[PDB]
């Protein structure tokens, strides 16, 4: 269970050669040559009936479909969503003030905390300034603004993750009756728990906001391009 022993310098290239990996691995002294169950029987449990039953389960299926598709060619792993990679931009560090664009908020300047295990970087304007809870945002729909806050050592709770920011719906009825699915007259009651846990993190950003004077008006304000404001003459 060892380390790499050939550290990378370019993606997919070892620094040490092929013969220099015949010394470092100590391969010159470990060269080697050295050399069902479907089930079991189940008892009968009956009269006049011995010699317990077959090794048999998960049998041949009840119905073959009339037409069959051919199986894929595989080609490469082209691995799924939860196993790619996470890539920030160069201009976003924990504490870099953002601008929400695609959301319902549309310009509400917020404070970046941490880039999650999913891709969506977590963010919050403090709710005493904005109207932003701990909502997730997508990486490329925000604008990094070149001012920074100092949250280098603040705290972040262990519990909140992708399973904390999702949505819920489940089909119990399957009949076209005049209810709206049985849960869609309904504002969601999961706010019983996030109200406590925002002040678990909102009660420690405000000592970090108010050090610099003009800043709490800067988050409470919003963003707009009106007259002579063009976004190629604006160092965000």
Partner 1 sequence: KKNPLKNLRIMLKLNPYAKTMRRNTILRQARNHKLRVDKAAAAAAALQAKS
Binding site for partner 1 (CB under 8 A): 9-10, 12-15, 17-18
Q: How far apart are CA 109 and CA 144, in angstroms?
A: 10
Given the complex with RNA, which of 53 and 182 has the nearer CB atom? 53
Q: Is 178 exposed, middle or buried (0-12, 13-18, 19+ CB in 10 A)?
A: exposed
Judged by CB, which is closer to RNA: 106, or 114?
106
Asked if 56 contacts 70 with a C-beta cutoff of 8 angstroms, the reply is no
Cβ of residue 15: shortest distance to partner 1, in angstroms? 7
Q: Which burial class, exposed, middle or buried, applies to 199 when counting CB atoms under 10 A from its CB (0-12, 13-18, 19+)?
A: exposed
Q: Among residue numbers 23 through 62, which ones bind RNA (CB under 7 A)? A: 23, 25-26, 28-38, 55-56, 58, 60
Q: How far is the CB of 122 from RNA (least distance, A)?
A: 16
Which entry of partner 1, RNA, none binds 224, CB below 5 to 8 A by partner kind?
A: RNA
Residue 145 binds: one of partner 1, RNA, none (C-beta under 5 to 8 A by kind): none
Looking at the DSSP assignment, which residues form a beta bridge with residue 114? Answer: 122
Cβ closest to partner 1, residue 37 vs residue 74: 74
Q: Does 130 bind RNA (CB under 7 A)?
A: yes
Residue 37, sorted as left (phi over 0), alpha (psi -120 to 50) or beta, turns out to be left
Token reading at 22: 């015949």
DSSP string, 39-82: -------SSS--S---S--S-S-S---SS-PPP----S----GG
* Residue 106 touches RNA, criterion: CB under 7 A: no
Which of RNA, partner 1, none has residue 187 at its interface (CB below 5 to 8 Å by kind)?
none
Residues within the interface to RNA (CB under 7 A): 1-6, 10-14, 17-23, 25-26, 28-38, 55-56, 58, 60, 68, 70-83, 87, 129-131, 220-229
């Amino acid at each position: 269970p060892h380390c790499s022993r050939n550290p990378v310098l370019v993606r997919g290239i070892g620094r040490y050669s092929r013969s220099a990996m015949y010394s470092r691995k100590a391969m010159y002294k470990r060269k080697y040559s050295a050399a069902v169950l479907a089930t079991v029987t189940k008892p009968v449990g009956g009269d006049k009936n011995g010699g317990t039953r077959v090794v048999k389960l998960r049998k041949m299926p009840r119905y073959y479909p009339t037409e069959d598709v051919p199986r894929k060619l595989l080609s490469h792993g082209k691995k799924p969503f939860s196993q790619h990679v996470r890539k920030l931009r160069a201009s976003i560090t924990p504490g870099t003030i953002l601008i929400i664009l695609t959301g319902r908020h549309r310009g509400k300047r917020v404070v970046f905390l941490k880039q999650l295990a999913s891709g969506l970087l977590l963010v919050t304007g403090p709710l005493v300034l904005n109207r932003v809870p701990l909502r997730r945002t997508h990486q490329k729909f925000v604008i990094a603004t070149s001012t920074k806050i100092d949250i280098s050592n603040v705290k972040i709770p262990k519990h909140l993750t992708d399973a904390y920011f999702k949505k819920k719906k489940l089909r119990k009825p399957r009949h076209q009756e005049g209810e709206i699915f049985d849960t869609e007259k309904e504002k969601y009651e999961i706010t019983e728990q996030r109200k406590i846990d925002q002040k678990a993190v909102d009660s420690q950003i405000l000592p970090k906001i108010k050090a610099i004077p003009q800043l709490q008006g800067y988050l409470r304000s919003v963003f707009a391009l009106t007259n002579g404001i063009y976004p190629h003459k604006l160092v965000f």
